[PDB]
Write a protein that binds this ligand. Structure first.
Ligand SMILES: CCCCCCCCCCCCCCCCCC(=O)OC[C@H](COP(=O)([O-])OCC(O)COP(=O)([O-])OC[C@@H](COC(=O)CCCCCCCCCCCCCCCCC)OC(=O)CCCCCCCCCCCCCCCCC)OC(=O)CCCCCCCCCCCCCCCCC
Ligand SMILES: COC1=C(OC)C(=O)C(C/C=C(/C)CC/C=C(/C)CC/C=C(/C)CC/C=C(\C)CC/C=C(\C)CC/C=C(\C)CC/C=C(/C)CC/C=C(/C)CC/C=C(/C)CCC=C(C)C)=C(C)C1=O
Ligand SMILES: CCCCCCCCCCCCCCCCC[C@@H](O)O[C@H](CO[C@H](O)CCCCCCCCCCCCCCC)COP(=O)(O)OCC[N+](C)(C)C
Ligand SMILES: CCCCCCCCCCCCCCCCC[C@@H](O)O[C@H](CO[C@H](O)CCCCCCCCCCCCCCC)COP(=O)(O)OCC[N+](C)(C)C
Ligand SMILES: CCCCCCCC/C=C\CCCCCCCC(=O)OC[C@H](COP(=O)(O)OCCN)OC(=O)CCCCCCC/C=C\CCCCCCCC
Ligand SMILES: CCCCCCCC/C=C\CCCCCCCC(=O)OC[C@H](COP(=O)(O)OCCN)OC(=O)CCCCCCC/C=C\CCCCCCCC
Ligand SMILES: CCCCCCCC/C=C\CCCCCCCC(=O)OC[C@H](COP(=O)(O)OCCN)OC(=O)CCCCCCC/C=C\CCCCCCCC
Ligand SMILES: CCCCCCCC/C=C\CCCCCCCC(=O)O[C@H](COC(=O)CCCCCCC/C=C/CCCCCCCC)COP(=O)(O)OCCN
Ligand SMILES: CCCCCCCCCCC1=C(C)C(=O)C(OC)=C(OC)C1=O
Ligand code: SF4
Ligand code: SF4
Ligand code: SF4
Lengths: 176, 96, 318, 215, 156, 70, 115
């Protein structure tokens, strides 16, 4: 089922001919366009006062990565390396060994933030909610090297954003 | 209704703590609206809301003038917002 | 004391031009559901100063293939002519009182095109050459119609003296007698100042930057200053020509305020038109000027020659 | 070049301003995506299709998911299919806004772009609320969608859709009947139905010539 | 010292002028540019900060590399960077420009635009949100504010 | 908003006030305060030259009335 | 005398602005910065090559139509003559011939650009 967009014939009576001639000589549709712009002039603009006002986000927002802890302070990560296997950009590098107490923990956990595509597959693949994409998005640097995150940087990110991260996970975890 | 908007302007002048407060807010945030205070940081940022403004302008923060070590009277950025007020300010929650 | 008057004419025009850019950015923004500059100073009042300081502290470059003499000469000619074309305007008194001010203004307008032409040719780039040839085509399109419209309108004035236009429109605006020509005249001004929808010499979406693509920093700023000054000047000329303010010999400030307000209205109308319309193709501009504007202009010139003789309304001062 | 979309090198032979020959040089954005796909799993390969046509993300996601589901001989659940069609039409709205407004900007009408990009921002908010990404959602996957809709999303979509028609009306008031727009667009780039079929065209480039075809 | 005070004030003035009027080149490569187009959209309105796109490299101040840089395109990017008059700044936007991103291991992709041009700000994301890009430009403004060219000249 | 466009416009208006007003004042300051004479034709110039010659101070705008016919 | 002073002042101000723009900032000129611009690449040919004019006939006609302006400008003064009938006849005749020239070129496809 279809319709035509440009298949209408103008009427040839004297009234229509005079209307079209007056349109040509007096520029009525151009005045209509001017009126549309003038109408927009007196509308309230849609601009927000950044950085004092921020754009709306969601609990599902994928921002800066972070490594989480259990309420006791123990690391959630167990070096299963699922995030490394699933990473479409190979942005994660992991090395592990038994800890001094025999625990299964990482010794290297690096994310190349200039390789990352910020897809969130790593936090889907994680079985213990150890690695997350946080809500932060304002972390521009001045050198390339500052965007090569090691385990200390990610643990600091987790310790710094845990209050917001836990609330977002509490809001979202029943959809996952 | 012109006198009404003029009186609203004078009210915005008077509600910022005098002419000096009006000028401080004009040259610090390029805005002179007045809203109900929601709370304050331990760093000095004050958070205001106004539900009569459209979505995006209904929540805002007046940043502090002195964060951890630097003078932020003019040098402000969005990274100074702590995570809890970050969640409130970006409308990921309806609760301060 | 005459040099003081020259300076009091030229410096405020530049200041006005600088602020005009700010107004256009804000007017365009609010017509596009945004704000425009409102951060650099209160309401963006310091933005033009920042733009000027940035432009005049940046490095200018001489293209390796360019012809240096003409490359340097063209912006000087543009800005000097833009400044010169204000001296015969009665506001309500002119800095220079000429018997033939309209013809002088026409000649200086005709000379102003060569800044664009020589900048485009001396840049020695392909896009600049295309912009210069578009300028040639634009002049060929609009020149004769503009001149004949001026002649037909001034047939009711009695002379080419600009100040006489104040006496001619003492009781009624000339537009009420020549509103058709006025419309055409308005369009001609849009073509004369290379303004949208006839911004073809620059043509950003087609020629990157057109004739001034190779210009940077101060010379580019001078080209911008000249163009905006010409915009304000032509709108002031239109206001004097078609919307005659009543002049009090003992209170000339009333005339000055009226004239300035009318000029600002016409300039804001220019900005509105830029915000409202797409761009012509530069052959379509010539076809519009030669196949629609020229026949009506010739017929109306005939009618305006016959009209004062028919009604016994020939103006004085042979 | 403002009209070259950043990565097109159009070598043109001109006589005056009349175009004698157009030779498009492409590959300035060739990233070797198809070779990269051969080293990824199917789920790992999914996010490449977001970046294929980054004006219509979920439509490419849907095409890839349909291909993989056809090869797997499985069926997505009905609610996933309805969500797919809804977000595909939202994506079509985004793509057509971008196309029409950038076209008008190229001709010279720069105002409707700003009017319609606020609507684009609202649909980006819908994308982010459903997936957490404004553009590269990766939401549509072989088997269905990644997550269910959050509560209240349908109401906001209805609120946007009940007002989008007036924005279309304003754009049409600006462009459709303008004589400058018609002078710039009427009888420009005319292609016949037979030539369009033989040259491999599809979509509007077919339907503009009267060919009654929609997939 | 009077001279130190004078050069400090002049540095302040020139830095304010240069950071309050930042004109980026009309230059984008890939999906990131779309988000850049959303930074000029009414909601964020980059023009309100004094940021205006200009097509000519001679009339521009900032290079925003918004998209993947291929090997076929690198000479053109270097050419239009070289044709920018000084002072000039480069902002690398998105994972592809930062380090290659999703196509890092490709045969035809430059692994980061910093192999071709010096970079002042790196904006992470794939793509960064328009708000994140605005944060990047404001950080670049602060960095320009920290410049002391005339003080360095005076202390030579 | 739109009234936030008004301030810049006002500045422009003030600038555009300066030239004409200045001219008027200057025309009054250098012409005895009485609207600088216009001479488009040689008759007006001859009148001005006669005025200058009979002024007694080489200034056309110094007007001599009936008090000069003793 | 006054117009000469005004012209000298305007030209001097423009030249001083150019001098400031060229002598105040720091210049770093090298061969890549000063090369011609063709949006990413070296131009294939020269910009001094011939550039065809598709509106050449209209350009020539502009020369002839520009002198009708010279002939028609003294009309305000001509309107003050005693024999208004002769003056009106001559002015109308001149405009009629101009219109006939325009019509002749229009009907002979002289206003269409070369392909
Ligand atoms: C008596 C003798 C006549 C005196 C001539 C007056 C001065 C002009 C000559 C100086 C320019 C030459 C500089 C040069 O070669 O390289 C620049 C120099 C060397 O660079 P380079 O790359 O190594 O050299 C490149 C090649 O050598 C060559 O580079 P090129 O490609 O640029 O070569 C062309 C250049 C080379 O010059 C020559 O070929 C020889 C000079 C003789 C030129 C005279 C021809 C007559 C033209 C008409 C009459 C003009 C007035 C003359 C009467 C004098 C009384 C006023 O010739 C010109 O373009 C000069 C044109 C002057 C006309 C300007 C008038 C503007 C007209 C606007 C409309 C007016 C309205 C109606 C009135 O670089 C610089 O110093 C920076 C720019 C300097 C240019 C500043 C402005 C130029 C002079 C303005 C004219 C004065 C008007 C008052
Ligand atoms: C669709 O995007 C675009 C816009 O929209 C956002 C624009 O506005 C726009 C126009 C360009 C603007 C950004 C304005 C730029 C401002 C000028 C280039 C600066 C010029 C101002 C000075 C050089 C004038 C001199 C300043 C003096 C103080 C005047 C007094 C002189 C002394 C001697 C005293 C363009 C081209 C554009 O493309
Ligand atoms: C007369 C013709 C020749 C001279 C031509 C130029 C004329 C002088 C230029 C006019 C100067 C006015 C500019 C001052 C504006 C500063 C406003 C303020 O914002 O600056 C603050 C502090 O000021 C700056 O640090 C220094 C600028 C002041 C310049 C010093 C005065 C030197 C004047 C000397 C003039 C001599 C000219 C040459 C003589 C030969 C920093 O705040 P900022 O971070 O940005 O904003 C953050 C954005 N927020 C507000 C939204 C959060
Ligand atoms: C708004 C309109 C009004 C403006 C009014 C002012 C007009 C200004 C015109 C242009 C001046 C602005 C330029 C800034 C200062 C001038 C510096 C330059 O012109 O001269 C320098 C002087 O260099 C000379 O070659 C060496 C000096 C020796 C020659 C002088 C001759 C006489 C001096 C002998 C000593 C005894 C004193 C005699 C005088 C009383 C050359 O420096 P250079 O590096 O190339 O160029 C880059 C300049 N930078 C660094 C600022 C970017
Ligand atoms: C300050 C000292 C002033 C020195 C003047 C030297 C002029 C000169 O030719 O030098 C070239 C100089 C810069 O070259 P660099 O040395 O590489 O850069 C400086 C850093 N070392 O170029 C310029 O600045 C050119 C300035 C133009 C001079 C002004 C005279 C132009 C006359 C124009 C007349 C035509 C007017 C047309 C309109 C009039 C019609 C009514
Ligand atoms: C360049 C353009 C030259 C023409 C400028 C026009 C000036 C003008 O029209 O003023 C006319 C004015 C008054 O005439 P009326 O209006 O009839 O009133 C007299 C009765 N009270 O006439 C004058 O003042 C004559 C003064 C001499 C004319 C100026 C000549 C300047 C010509 C340009 C030379 C440039 C300098 C030489 C270098 C060449 C370029 C490198
Ligand atoms: C039309 C509107 C604008 C009018 C034009 C006038 C603009 C006025 C601007 C005044 C601000 C002061 C200008 C300072 C910027 C000068 C350019 C600059 O930054 O050069 C830095 C340069 C760095 O050199 P080095 O460190 O030794 O070498 C490193 C590279 N190998 O330092 C200098 O050269 C110092 C020069 C002193 C600047 C002069 C200050 C005087 C200002 C007078 C303005 C004249 C107005 C007329
Ligand atoms: C009893 C005897 C009385 C004497 C007779 C008086 C009656 C006169 C009746 C006719 C008057 C018509 C005047 C208008 C002249 C030109 C009109 C025209 O037809 O031109 C159009 C085109 O004109 C335009 O569209 C203009 C385009 C540029 C638009 C730029 C902005 C528009 C301006 C908006 C506001 C205008 C304000 C003007 C006055 C301002 C005050 C000075 C022709 O082009 P096309 O439609 O494409 O067709 C050509 C093939 N047939
Ligand atoms: C002035 C209104 C906003 C214009 C912003 C200019 C951005 C320039 C980037 C070039 C570009 C354009 C023009 C463009 O249209 C496009 O879409 C195909 C791109 O790919 C994302 C681009 O990279
Ligand atoms: S967000 Fe995606 S690309 Fe980034 S580390 Fe996680 S899985 Fe890898
Ligand atoms: S972050 Fe999670 S998925 Fe990755 S290695 Fe640690 S426990 Fe395994
Ligand atoms: S970083 Fe991501 S969004 Fe940006 S250009 Fe590369 S693939 Fe596209």
């Amino acid at each position: 089922t279809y319709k035509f967009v440009n298949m209408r014939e103008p009427s040839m009576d004297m009234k229509s001919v005079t209307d079209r001639a007056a349109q040509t000589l007096l520029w009525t549709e151009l005045v209509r366009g001017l009126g549309m712009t003038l109408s927009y002039l007196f509308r309230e603009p849609a601009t927000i006062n950044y950085p004092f006002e921020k754009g709306p986000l969601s609990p599902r927002f994928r921002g800066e990565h972070a490594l989480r802890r259990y309420p006791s302070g123990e690391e959630r990560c167990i070096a299963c390396k699922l995030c490394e296997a699933v990473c479409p950009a190979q942005a994660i590098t992991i090395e592990a060994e038994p800890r001094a107490d025999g625990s299964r923990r990482t010794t290297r956990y690096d994310i190349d933030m200039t390789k990352c595509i910020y897809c969130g597959f790593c936090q889907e693949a994680c079985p213990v909610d150890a690695i997350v994409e946080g809500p932060n998005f304002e972390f521009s640097t001045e050198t390339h090297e500052e965007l090569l995150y090691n385990k200390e940087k990610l643990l600091n990110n987790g310790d710094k954003w845990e209050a917001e991260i836990a609330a977002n996970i509490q809001a979202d975890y029943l959809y996952r | 209704e012109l006198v009404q908007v003029l009186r609203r302007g004078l009210q915005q002048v008077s509600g910022h703590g005098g002419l000096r407060g009006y000028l401080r807010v004009l040259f610090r945030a390029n805005d002179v609206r007045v809203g109900t205070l929601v709370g304050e940081d331990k760093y000095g940022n004050k958070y205001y809301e106004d539900n009569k403004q459209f979505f995006g302008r209904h929540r805002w923060v007046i940043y502090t003038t002195e964060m951890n070590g630097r003078d932020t009277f003019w040098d402000v950025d969005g990274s100074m917002v702590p995570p809890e007020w970050h969640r409130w300010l970006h409308c990921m929650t309806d609760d301060p | 004391m005459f040099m003081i008057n020259i300076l009091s004419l030229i410096i405020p025009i530049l200041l006005a031009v600088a602020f005009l850019t700010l107004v256009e950015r804000k007017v365009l923004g609010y017509m596009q559901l945004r704000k425009g500059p409102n951060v650099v100073g209160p309401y963006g009042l310091l933005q033009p100063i920042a733009d000027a300081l940035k432009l005049f502290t940046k490095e200018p470059l001489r293209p390796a293939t360019s012809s240096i003499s003409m490359f340097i000469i063209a912006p000087i000619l543009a800005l000097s002519l833009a400044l010169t074309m204000w001296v015969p305007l009665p506001m309500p008194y002119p800095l220079i009182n000429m018997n033939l001010g309209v013809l002088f203004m026409l000649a200086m307008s005709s000379l102003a095109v060569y800044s664009i032409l020589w900048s485009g040719w001396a840049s020695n780039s392909k896009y600049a050459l295309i912009g210069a040839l578009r300028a040639v085509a634009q002049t060929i399109s609009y020149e004769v119609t503009l001149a004949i419209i001026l002649l037909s309108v001034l047939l009711m004035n009695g002379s080419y003296t600009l100040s006489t236009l104040i006496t001619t429109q003492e009781h009624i605006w000339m537009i009420f007698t020549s509103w058709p020509l006025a419309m055409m005249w308005f369009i001609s001004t849009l073509a004369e100042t290379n303004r949208a929808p006839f911004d073809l010499t620059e043509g950003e979406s087609e020629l990157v930057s057109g004739f001034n693509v190779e210009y940077a920093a101060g010379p580019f700023a001078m080209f911008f200053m000249a163009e905006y000054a010409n915009i304000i000047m032509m709108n002031a000329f239109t206001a004097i020509l078609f919307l005659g303010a009543s002049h009090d010999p003992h209170t000339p400030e009333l005339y000055t305020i009226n004239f300035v307000l009318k000029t600002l209205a016409l300039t804001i109308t220019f900005l509105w038109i830029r915000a409202s319309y797409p761009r012509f193709r530069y052959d379509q501009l010539m076809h519009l000027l030669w196949k629609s504007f020229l026949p009506l202009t010739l017929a109306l010139c005939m009618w305006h020659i016959s009209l004062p003789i028919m009604t016994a309304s020939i103006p004085p001062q042979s | 070049h403002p009209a070259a979309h950043g990565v097109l090198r159009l070598v043109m032979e001109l006589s005056g301003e009349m175009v004698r020959k157009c030779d498009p040089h492409i590959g300035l954005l060739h990233r070797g995506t198809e070779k990269l796909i051969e080293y990824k799993t199917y789920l790992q390969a999914l996010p490449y299709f977001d970046r294929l046509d980054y004006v219509s993300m979920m439509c490419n996601e849907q095409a890839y998911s349909l291909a993989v589901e056809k090869l797997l001989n499985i069926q997505p659940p009905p609610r996933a299919q309805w969500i797919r069609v809804l977000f595909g039409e939202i994506t079509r709205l985004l793509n057509h806004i971008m196309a029409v407004t950038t076209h008008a900007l190229d001709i010279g009408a720069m105002t409707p772009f700003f009017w319609m990009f606020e609507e684009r921002e609202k649909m980006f908010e819908f994308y982010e609320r459903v997936s957490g990404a404004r553009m590269h959602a990766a939401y549509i996957r072989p088997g269905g969608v990644h997550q269910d809709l959050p509560l209240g999303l349908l109401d906001d979509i209805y609120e946007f859709s009940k007002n989008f028609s007036f924005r279309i009306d304003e754009l049409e008031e600006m462009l459709t009947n303008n004589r400058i727009w018609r002078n710039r667009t009427v009888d420009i780039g005319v292609v016949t139905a037979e030539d369009a079929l033989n040259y491999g065209f599809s979509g509007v480039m077919l339907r503009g010539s009267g060919i009654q075809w929609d997939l | 010292s009077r001279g130190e005070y004078v050069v400090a004030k002049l540095d302040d003035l020139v830095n304010w002028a240069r950071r309050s009027s930042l004109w980026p080149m009309t230059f984008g490569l890939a999906c990131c540019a779309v988000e850049m187009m959303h930074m000029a959209a009414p909601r964020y309105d980059m023009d309100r900060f004094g940021v205006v796109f200009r097509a000519s490299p001679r009339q521009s101040d900032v290079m925003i590399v918004a998209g993947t840089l291929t090997n076929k395109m690198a000479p053109a990017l270097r050419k239009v960077y070289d044709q920018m008059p000084e002072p000039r700044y480069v902002v690398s936007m998105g994972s592809c420009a930062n380090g290659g991103g999703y196509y890092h291991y490709s045969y035809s992709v430059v692994r980061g635009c910093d192999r071709i041009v010096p970079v002042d700000i790196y904006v992470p994301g794939c793509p960064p949100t328009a708000e994140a890009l605005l944060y990047g430009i404001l950080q670049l403004q602060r960095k320009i504010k920290r410049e002391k060219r005339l003080r360095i000249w005076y202390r030579r | 908003m739109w009234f936030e466009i008004l301030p810049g416009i006002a500045v422009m208006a003030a600038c555009l006030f300066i030239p004409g007003m200045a001219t008027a004042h200057i025309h009054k300051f250098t012409n005895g305060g009485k609207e600088k004479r216009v001479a488009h034709f040689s008759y007006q110039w001859n009148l001005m030259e006669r005025d200058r010659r009979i002024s007694g101070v080489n200034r056309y705008h110094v007007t001599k009335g009936l008090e000069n016919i003793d | 005398m006054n117009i000469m002073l005004t012209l000298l002042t305007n030209v001097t101000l423009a030249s001083l602005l150019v001098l400031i723009a060229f002598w105040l900032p720091q210049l770093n000129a090298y061969s890549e910065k000063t090369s011609p611009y063709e949006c990413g690449f070296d131009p294939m040919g020269s910009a001094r090559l011939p550039f065809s004019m598709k509106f050449f006939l209209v350009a020539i006609t502009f020369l002839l139509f520009d002198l009708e302006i010279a002939l028609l400008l003294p009309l305000p003064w001509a309107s003050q003559t005693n024999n208004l009938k002769t003056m009106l006849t001559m002015a109308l005749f001149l405009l009629i011939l101009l219109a006939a020239s325009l019509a002749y070129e229009w009907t002979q496809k002289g206003l269409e650009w070369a392909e």
